[PDB]
Coordinates of C-alpha atoms and ligand atoms in Angstrom, one line a residue:
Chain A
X1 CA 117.4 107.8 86.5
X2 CA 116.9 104.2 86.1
X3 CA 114.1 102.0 87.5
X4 CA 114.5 99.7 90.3
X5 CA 112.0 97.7 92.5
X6 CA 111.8 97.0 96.2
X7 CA 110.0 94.2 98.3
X8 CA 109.8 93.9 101.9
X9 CA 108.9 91.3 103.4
X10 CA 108.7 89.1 106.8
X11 CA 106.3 88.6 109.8
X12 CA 103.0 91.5 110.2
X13 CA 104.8 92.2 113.8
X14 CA 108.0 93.2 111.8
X15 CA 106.7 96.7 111.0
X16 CA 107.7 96.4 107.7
X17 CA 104.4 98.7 106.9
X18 CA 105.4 101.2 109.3
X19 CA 109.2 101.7 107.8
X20 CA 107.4 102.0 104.3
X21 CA 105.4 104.5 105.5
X22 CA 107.8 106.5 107.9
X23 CA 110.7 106.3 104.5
X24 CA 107.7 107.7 102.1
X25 CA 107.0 110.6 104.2
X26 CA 110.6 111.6 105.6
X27 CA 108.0 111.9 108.8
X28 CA 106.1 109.7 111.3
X29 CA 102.8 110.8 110.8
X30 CA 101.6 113.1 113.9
X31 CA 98.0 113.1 113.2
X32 CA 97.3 109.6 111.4
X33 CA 98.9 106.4 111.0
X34 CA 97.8 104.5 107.7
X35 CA 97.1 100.8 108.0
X36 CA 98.2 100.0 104.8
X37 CA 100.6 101.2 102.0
X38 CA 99.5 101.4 98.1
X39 CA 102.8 101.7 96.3
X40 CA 105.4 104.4 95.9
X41 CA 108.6 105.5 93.6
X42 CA 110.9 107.1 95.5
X43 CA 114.0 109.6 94.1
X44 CA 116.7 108.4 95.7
X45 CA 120.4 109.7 94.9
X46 CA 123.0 107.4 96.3
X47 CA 126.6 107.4 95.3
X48 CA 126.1 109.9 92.5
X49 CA 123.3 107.6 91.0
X50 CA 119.9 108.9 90.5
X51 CA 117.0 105.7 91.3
X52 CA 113.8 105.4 90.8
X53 CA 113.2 102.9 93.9
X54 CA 109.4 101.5 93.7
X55 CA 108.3 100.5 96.8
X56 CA 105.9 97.4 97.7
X57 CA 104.6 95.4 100.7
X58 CA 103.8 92.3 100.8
X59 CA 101.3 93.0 104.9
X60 CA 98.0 91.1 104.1
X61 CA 99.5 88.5 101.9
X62 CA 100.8 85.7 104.8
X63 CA 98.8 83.7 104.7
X64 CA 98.2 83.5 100.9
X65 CA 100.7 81.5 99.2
X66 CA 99.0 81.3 96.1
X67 CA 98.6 85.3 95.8
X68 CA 101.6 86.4 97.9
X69 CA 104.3 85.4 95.1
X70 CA 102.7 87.9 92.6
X71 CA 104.7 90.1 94.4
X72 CA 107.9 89.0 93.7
X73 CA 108.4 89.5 89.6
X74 CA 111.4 92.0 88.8
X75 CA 112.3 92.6 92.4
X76 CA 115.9 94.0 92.3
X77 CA 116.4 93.7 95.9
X78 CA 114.7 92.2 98.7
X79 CA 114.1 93.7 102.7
X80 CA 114.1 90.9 104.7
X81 CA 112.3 92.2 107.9
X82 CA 112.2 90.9 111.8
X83 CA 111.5 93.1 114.9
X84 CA 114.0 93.3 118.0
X85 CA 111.5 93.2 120.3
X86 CA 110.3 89.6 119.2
X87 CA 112.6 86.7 118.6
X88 CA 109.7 85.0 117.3
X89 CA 110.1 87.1 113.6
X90 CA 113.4 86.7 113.8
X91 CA 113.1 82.6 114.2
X92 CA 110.7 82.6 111.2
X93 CA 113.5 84.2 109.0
X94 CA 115.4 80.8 108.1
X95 CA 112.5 78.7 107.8
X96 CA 109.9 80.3 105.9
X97 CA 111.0 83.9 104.1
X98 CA 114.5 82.4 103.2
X99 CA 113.7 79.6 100.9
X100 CA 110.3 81.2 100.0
X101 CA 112.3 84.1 98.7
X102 CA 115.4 82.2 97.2
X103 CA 113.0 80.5 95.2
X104 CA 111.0 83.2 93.6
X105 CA 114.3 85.8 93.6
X106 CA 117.0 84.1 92.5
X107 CA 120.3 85.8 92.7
X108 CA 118.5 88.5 93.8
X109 CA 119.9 90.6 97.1
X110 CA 118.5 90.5 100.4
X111 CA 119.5 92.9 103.1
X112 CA 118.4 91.5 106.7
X113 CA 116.5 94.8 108.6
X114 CA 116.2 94.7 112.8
X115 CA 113.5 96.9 113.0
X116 CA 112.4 98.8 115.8
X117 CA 116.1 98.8 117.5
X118 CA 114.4 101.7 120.3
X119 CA 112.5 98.8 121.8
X120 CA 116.3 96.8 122.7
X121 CA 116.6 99.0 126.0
X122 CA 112.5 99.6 126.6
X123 CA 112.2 98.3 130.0
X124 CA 108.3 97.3 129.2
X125 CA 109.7 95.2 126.3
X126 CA 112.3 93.5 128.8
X127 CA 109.5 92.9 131.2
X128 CA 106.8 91.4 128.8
X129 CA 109.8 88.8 126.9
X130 CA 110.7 87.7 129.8
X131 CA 107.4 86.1 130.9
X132 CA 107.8 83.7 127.5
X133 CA 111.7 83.4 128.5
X134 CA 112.9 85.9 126.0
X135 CA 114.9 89.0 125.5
X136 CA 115.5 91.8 122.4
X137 CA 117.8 90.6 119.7
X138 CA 121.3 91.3 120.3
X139 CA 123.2 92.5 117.6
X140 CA 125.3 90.0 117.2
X141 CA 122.4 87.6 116.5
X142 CA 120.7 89.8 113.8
X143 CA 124.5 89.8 112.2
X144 CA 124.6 85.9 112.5
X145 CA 121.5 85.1 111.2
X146 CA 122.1 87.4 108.3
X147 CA 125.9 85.9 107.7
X148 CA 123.6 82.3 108.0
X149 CA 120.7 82.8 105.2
X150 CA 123.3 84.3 102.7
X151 CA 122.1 88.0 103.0
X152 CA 124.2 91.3 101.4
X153 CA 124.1 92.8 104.6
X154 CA 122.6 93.4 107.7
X155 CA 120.8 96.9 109.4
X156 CA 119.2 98.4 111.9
X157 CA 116.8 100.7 112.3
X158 CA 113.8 102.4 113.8
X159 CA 111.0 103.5 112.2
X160 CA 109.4 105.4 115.1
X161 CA 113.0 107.9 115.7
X162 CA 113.7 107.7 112.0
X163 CA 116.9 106.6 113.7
X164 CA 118.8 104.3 110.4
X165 CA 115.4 104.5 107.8
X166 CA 117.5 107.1 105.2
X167 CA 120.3 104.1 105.2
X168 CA 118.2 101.0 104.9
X169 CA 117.0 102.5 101.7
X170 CA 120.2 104.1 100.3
X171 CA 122.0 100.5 100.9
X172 CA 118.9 99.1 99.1
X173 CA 119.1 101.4 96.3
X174 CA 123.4 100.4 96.1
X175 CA 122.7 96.7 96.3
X176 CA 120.0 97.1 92.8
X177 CA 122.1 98.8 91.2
X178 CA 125.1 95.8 91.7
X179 CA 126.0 93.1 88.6
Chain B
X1 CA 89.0 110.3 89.5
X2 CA 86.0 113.5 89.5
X3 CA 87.3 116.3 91.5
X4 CA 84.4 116.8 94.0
X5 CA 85.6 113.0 95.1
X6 CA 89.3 114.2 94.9
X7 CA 88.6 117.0 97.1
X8 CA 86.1 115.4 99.5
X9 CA 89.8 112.9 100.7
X10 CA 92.3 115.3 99.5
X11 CA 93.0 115.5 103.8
X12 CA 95.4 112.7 105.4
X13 CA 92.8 111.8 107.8
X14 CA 88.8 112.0 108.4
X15 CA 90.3 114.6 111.7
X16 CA 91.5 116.9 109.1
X17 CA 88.7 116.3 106.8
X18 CA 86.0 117.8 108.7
X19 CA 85.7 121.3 110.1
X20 CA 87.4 121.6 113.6
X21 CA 84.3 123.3 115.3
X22 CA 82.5 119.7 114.3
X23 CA 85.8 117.2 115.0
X24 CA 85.7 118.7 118.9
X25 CA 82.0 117.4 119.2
X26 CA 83.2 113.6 118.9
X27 CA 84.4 111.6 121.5
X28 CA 88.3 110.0 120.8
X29 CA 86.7 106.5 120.0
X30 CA 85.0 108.0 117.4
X31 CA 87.4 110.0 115.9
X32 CA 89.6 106.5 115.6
X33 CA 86.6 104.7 114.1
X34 CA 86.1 107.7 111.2
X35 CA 90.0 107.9 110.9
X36 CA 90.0 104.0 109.5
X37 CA 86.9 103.7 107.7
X38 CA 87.8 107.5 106.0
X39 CA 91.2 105.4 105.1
X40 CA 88.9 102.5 103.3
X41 CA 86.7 104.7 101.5
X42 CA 90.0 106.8 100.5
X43 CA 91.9 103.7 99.5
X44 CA 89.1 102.4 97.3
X45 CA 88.5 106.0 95.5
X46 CA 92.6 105.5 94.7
X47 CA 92.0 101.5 93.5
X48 CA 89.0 102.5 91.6
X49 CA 91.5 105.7 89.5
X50 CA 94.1 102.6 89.1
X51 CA 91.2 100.6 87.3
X52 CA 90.3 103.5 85.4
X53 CA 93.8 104.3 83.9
X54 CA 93.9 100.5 82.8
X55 CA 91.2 100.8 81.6
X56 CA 90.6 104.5 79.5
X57 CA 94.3 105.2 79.5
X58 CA 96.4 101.4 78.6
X59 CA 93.8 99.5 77.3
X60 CA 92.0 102.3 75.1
X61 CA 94.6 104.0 74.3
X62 CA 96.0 100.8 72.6
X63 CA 93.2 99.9 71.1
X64 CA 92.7 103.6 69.4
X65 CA 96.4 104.4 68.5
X66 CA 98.1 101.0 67.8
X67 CA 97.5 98.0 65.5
X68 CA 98.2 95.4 68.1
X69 CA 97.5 91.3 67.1
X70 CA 93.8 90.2 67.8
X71 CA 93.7 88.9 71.6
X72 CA 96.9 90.8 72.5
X73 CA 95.2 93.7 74.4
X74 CA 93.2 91.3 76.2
X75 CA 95.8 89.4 77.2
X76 CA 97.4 92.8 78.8
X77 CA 94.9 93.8 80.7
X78 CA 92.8 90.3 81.5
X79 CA 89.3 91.3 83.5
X80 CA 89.7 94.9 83.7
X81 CA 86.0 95.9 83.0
X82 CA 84.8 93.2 85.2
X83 CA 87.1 94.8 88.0
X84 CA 86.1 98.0 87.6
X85 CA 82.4 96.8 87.6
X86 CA 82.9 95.4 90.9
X87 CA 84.7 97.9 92.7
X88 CA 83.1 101.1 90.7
X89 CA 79.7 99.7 92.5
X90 CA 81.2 99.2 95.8
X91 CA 82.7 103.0 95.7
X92 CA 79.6 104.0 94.7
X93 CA 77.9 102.4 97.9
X94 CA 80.6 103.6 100.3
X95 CA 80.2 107.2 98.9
X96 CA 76.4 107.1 99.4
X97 CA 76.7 105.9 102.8
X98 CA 79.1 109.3 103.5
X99 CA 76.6 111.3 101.5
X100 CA 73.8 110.4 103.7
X101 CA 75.8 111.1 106.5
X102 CA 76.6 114.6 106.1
X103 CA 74.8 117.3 108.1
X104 CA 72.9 119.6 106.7
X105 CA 74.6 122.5 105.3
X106 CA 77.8 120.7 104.8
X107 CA 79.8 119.2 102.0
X108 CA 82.3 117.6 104.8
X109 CA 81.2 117.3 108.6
X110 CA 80.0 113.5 108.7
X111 CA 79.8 109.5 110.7
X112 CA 79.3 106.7 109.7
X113 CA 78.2 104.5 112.1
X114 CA 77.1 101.8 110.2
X115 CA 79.5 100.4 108.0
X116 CA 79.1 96.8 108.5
X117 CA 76.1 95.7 106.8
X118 CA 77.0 97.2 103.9
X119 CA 80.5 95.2 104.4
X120 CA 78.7 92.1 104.5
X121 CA 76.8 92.5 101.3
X122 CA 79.5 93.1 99.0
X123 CA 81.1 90.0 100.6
X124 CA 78.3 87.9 100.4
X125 CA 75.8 86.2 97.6
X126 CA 76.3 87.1 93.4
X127 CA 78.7 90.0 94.2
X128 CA 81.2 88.0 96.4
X129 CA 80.6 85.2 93.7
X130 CA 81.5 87.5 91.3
X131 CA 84.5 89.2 93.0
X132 CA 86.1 85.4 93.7
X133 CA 85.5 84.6 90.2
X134 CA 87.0 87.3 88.4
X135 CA 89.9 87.5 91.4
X136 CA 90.5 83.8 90.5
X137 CA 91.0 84.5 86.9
X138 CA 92.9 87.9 86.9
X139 CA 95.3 86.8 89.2
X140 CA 96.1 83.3 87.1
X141 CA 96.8 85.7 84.4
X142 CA 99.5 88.0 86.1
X143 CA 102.0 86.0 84.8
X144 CA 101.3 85.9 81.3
X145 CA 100.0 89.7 81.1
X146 CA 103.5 90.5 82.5
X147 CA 105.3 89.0 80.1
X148 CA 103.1 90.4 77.4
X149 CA 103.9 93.5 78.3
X150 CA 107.6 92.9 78.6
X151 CA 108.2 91.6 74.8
X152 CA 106.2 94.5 73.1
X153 CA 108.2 96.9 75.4
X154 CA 111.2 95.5 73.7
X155 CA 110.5 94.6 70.2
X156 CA 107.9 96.9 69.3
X157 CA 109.0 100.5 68.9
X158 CA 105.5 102.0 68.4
X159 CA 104.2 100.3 71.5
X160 CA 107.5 101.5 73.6
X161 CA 106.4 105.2 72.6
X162 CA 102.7 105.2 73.3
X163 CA 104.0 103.9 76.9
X164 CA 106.5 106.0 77.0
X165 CA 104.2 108.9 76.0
X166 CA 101.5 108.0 78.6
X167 CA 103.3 107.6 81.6
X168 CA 105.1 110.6 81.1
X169 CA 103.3 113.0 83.3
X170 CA 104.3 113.1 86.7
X171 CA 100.5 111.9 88.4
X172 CA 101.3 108.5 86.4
X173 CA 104.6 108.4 88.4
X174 CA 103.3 105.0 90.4
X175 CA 101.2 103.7 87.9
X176 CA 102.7 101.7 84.5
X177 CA 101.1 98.4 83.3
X178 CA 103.4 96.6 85.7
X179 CA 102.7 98.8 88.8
X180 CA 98.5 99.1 87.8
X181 CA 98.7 95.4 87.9
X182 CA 100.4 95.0 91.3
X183 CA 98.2 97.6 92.5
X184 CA 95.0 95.7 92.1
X185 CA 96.2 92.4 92.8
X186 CA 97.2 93.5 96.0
X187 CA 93.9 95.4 96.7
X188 CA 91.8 92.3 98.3
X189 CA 94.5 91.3 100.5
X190 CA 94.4 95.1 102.2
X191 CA 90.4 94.5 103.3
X192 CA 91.2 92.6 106.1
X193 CA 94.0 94.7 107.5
X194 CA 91.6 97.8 107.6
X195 CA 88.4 96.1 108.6
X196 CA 90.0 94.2 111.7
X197 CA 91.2 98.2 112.5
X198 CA 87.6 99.5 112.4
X199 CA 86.1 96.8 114.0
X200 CA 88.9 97.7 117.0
X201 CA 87.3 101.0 117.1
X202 CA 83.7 99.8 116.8
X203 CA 83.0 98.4 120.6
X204 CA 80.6 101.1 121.6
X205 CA 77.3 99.6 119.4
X206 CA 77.3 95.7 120.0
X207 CA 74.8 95.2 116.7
X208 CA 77.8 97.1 114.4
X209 CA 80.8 94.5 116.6
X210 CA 79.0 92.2 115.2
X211 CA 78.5 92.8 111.7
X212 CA 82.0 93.9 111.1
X213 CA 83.1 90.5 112.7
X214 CA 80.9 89.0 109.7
X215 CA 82.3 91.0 107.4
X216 CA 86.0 90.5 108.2
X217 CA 85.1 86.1 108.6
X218 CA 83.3 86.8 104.7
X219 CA 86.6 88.5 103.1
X220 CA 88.9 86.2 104.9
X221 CA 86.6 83.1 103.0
X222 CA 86.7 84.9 99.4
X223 CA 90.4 85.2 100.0
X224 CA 91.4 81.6 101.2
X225 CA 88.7 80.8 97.8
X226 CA 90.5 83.2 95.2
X227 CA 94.0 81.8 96.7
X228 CA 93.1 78.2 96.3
X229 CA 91.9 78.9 92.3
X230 CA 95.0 80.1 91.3
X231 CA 97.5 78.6 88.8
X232 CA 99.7 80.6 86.8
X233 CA 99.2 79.9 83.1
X234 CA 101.8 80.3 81.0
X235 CA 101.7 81.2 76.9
X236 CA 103.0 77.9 75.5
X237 CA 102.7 75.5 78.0
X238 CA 102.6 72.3 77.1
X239 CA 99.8 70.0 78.3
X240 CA 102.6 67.5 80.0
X241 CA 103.4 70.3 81.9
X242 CA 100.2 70.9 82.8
X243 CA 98.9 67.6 83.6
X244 CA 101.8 66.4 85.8
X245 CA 101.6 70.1 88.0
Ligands
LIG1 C1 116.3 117.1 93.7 C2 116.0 115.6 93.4 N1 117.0 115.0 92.6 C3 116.3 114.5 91.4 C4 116.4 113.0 91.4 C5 117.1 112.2 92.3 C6 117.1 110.9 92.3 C7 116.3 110.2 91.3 C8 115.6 110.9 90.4 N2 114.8 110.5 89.3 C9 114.3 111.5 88.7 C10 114.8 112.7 89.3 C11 115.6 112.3 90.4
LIG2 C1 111.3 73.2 94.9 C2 111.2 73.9 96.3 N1 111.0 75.4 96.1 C3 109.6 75.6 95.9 C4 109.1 76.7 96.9 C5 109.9 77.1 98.0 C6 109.4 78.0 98.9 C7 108.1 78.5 98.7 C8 107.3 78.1 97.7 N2 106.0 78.4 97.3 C9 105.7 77.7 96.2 C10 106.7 76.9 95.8 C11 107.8 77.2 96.8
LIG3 C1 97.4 102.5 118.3 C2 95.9 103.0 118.4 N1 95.6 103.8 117.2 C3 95.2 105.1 117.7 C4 94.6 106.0 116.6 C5 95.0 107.4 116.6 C6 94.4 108.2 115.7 C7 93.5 107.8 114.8 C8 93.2 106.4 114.7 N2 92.3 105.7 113.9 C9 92.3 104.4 114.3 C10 93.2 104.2 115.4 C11 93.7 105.5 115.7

């Protein structure tokens, strides 16, 4: 079992807290949903490897640039998070996390994660976007964007159904462990 | 941590905390409110253990066992009795304030319902100048500590086995030097996130809306202060470098 570390980061309307937390547990909690998440080493098995994947979020540290890049030392692969139901994460992708995490990562990979993928066909999420002129991300533009900033790959998932979460981190785990 | 502490948040949430018979007196606003602040409280019991293994476990441990070069443990571990100073006090306050609290006959059936004031005095006056002081210094030194770390890991075998000795046990799973000092680094910037949740539960007594909106305007200042006093030093930087930053 060798050691490898994980950073997520992206906009606070991403959920990147929530998919910590929902991967952590194998659950979405019934009774409580935590605010925040500490830290966490999970034992992941992927392609007959055994990982140690420590887990770290970067929620609370936006608007501190001075404080937010102490996150970033020996990261061996990056989750670069945006939520379907707002174009506006998915906008801020190119312009601030990209370069931000190209610079403090070098060479390092970065998967590009559409979270909460159940909200695409929520008819209350269709209503709401288009009263600013907006619509969920399609596919295709999740895929472009992450083609675009140079990403390893691009997923989906949703941390609410579970629905893709297992994957994320298993493709995570595969992209550490690459020369 | 001491186990009546341990036990008192062994439960996910304050709902499974306290005895059912007393959780079915409380209206659902409430039970949101206790839910958050029970996960501040919790939160700070687990930042204060982190301080404590840096400091009885790493940094003793070092001191007792190895014959490390003068200035090199230090270096390690930059602040860590000042931090747990700070935030052994302010677990001590928040663990009053639940003691208080409780109901007569009980160990566990408690509310707090006023949170805020004591919010606003550990982010305000000598503590908060204390807290942005020692945040401004032990966060200029993550860089260098990490390194540290990194080349007696590598080139000193007696070093490599007291870490690899002491991290063994499985409770030490999230918690090396590296992880202990991610852990507490990233400890201030979790305030706001939890008190902005409370205060979204704490409508029902205007006097406590309004404290917890001071506190939450007094972390994000110490923040945006500890942020702005940060620069990264480095072990053999040269003053050119320095100088034209
Ligand atoms: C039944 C669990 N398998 C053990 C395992 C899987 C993956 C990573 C691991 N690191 C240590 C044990 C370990
Ligand atoms: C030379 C340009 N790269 C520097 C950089 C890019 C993105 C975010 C950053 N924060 C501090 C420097 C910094
Ligand atoms: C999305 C609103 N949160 C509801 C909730 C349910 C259970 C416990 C809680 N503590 C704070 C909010 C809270």
């Amino acid at each position: 079992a060798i050691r490898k570390k994980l950073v997520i980061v992206g906009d606070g309307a991403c959920g990147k807290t929530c998919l910590l937390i929902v991967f952590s547990k194998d659950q979405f909690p019934e009774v409580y949903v935590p605010t925040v998440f500490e830290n966490y080493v999970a034992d992941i098995e992927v392609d007959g490897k055994q990982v140690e994947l420590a887990l770290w979020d970067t929620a609370g540290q936006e608007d501190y640039d001075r404080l937010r890049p102490l996150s970033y030392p020996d990261t061996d692969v990056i989750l670069m998070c945006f939520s379907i139901d707002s174009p506006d994460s998915l906008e801020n992708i190119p312009e601030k996390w990209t370069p931000e995490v190209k610079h403090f990562c070098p060479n390092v990979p970065i998967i590009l994660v559409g979270n909460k993928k159940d909200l695409r066909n929520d008819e209350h999420t269709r209503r709401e976007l288009a009263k600013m002129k907006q619509e969920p991300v399609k596919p295709e533009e999740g895929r472009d964007m992450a083609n675009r900033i140079g990403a390893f790959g691009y997923m989906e998932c949703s941390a609410k159904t579970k629905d893709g979460v297992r994957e994320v981190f298993e493709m995570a785990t595969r992209a550490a462990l690459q020369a | 941590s001491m186990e009546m502490d341990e036990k008192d948040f062994a439960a996910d949430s304050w709902s499974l905390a306290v005895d059912s018979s007393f959780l079915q007196q409380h209206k659902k606003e409430v039970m949101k409110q206790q839910d958050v602040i029970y996960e501040l409280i919790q939160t700070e019991l687990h930042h204060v253990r982190t301080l404590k293994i840096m400091t009885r476990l790493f940094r003793t441990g070092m001191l007792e066992e190895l014959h490390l070069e003068p200035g090199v443990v230090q270096g390690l571990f930059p602040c860590v009795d000042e931090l747990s100073d700070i935030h052994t006090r302010f677990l001590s306050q928040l663990l009053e304030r639940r003691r208080q609290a409780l109901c007569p006959g009980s160990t566990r059936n408690f509310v707090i319902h006023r949170l805020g004031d004591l919010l606003i005095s550990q982010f305000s006056g000598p503590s908060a100048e204390q807290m942005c002081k020692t945040y401004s210094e032990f966060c200029s030194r993550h860089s260098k500590a990490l390194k540290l770390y990194k080349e007696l890991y590598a080139r000193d075998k007696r070093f490599q086995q007291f870490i690899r000795k002491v991290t063994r046990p499985a409770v030490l799973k999230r918690h090396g030097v590296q992880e202990c000092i991610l852990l507490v680094t990233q400890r201030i910037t979790k305030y706001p996130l939890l008190i902005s949740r409370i205060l979204q539960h704490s409508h029902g007594i205007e006097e406590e809306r309004q404290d917890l909106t001071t506190a939450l305007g007094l972390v994000k200042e110490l923040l945006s202060n500890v942020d702005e006093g940060i620069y990264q030093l480095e072990k053999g930087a040269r003053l050119q470098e320095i100088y034209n930053r």
